[PDB]
Design a protein around this ligand. Structure first.
Ligand code: CA
Length: 134
């Protein structure tokens, strides 16, 4: 049930999990909760989400609480300001350290507490089966 888009496969879960349990599910399937690194990818993801809330690989790292991608893609702060819902991230009750796709729109992301359970989206690069490149 993996959907293909620009060199990556994506898994849209049918069962809700916490942020970390979802990530462990993704890792068990040789993947990670999805990063988002372009306008077209965000569009593909929110359009496919169809108005439902999915955890993505948005989470906090460093002492600052800078946002990051659990798949280790460097987070581009400047290029990602267009992807949050206006007023987000707002850190409601000082306890929101994970991120989901919420609004069916380009401005779509929200921070929520990591312990809430939602559907989730895993992402994995297409890697062709090919011999030793050494
Ligand atoms: Ca929020």
């Amino acid at each position: 049930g993996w959907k293909y888009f620009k060199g990556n496969f994506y898994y849209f879960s049918l069962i809700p999990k916490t942020w970390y349990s979802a990530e462990q599910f993704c890792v068990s399937r040789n993947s990670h909760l999805t990063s988002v690194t372009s306008e077209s990818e965000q569009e593909f993801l929110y359009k496919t989400a169809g108005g439902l809330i999915y955890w993505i690989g948005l989470t906090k790292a460093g002492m600052e609480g800078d946002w990051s991608w659990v798949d280790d893609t460097p987070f581009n702060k400047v290029q990602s300001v267009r992807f949050w819902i206006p007023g987000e991230p707002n850190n409601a009750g000082n306890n929101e350290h994970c991120g989901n796709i919420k609004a069916p729109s380009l401005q779509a992301w929200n921070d929520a507490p990591c312990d809430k359970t939602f559907l989730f989206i895993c992402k994995r690069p297409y890697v062709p089966s090919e011999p030793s490149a050494w």
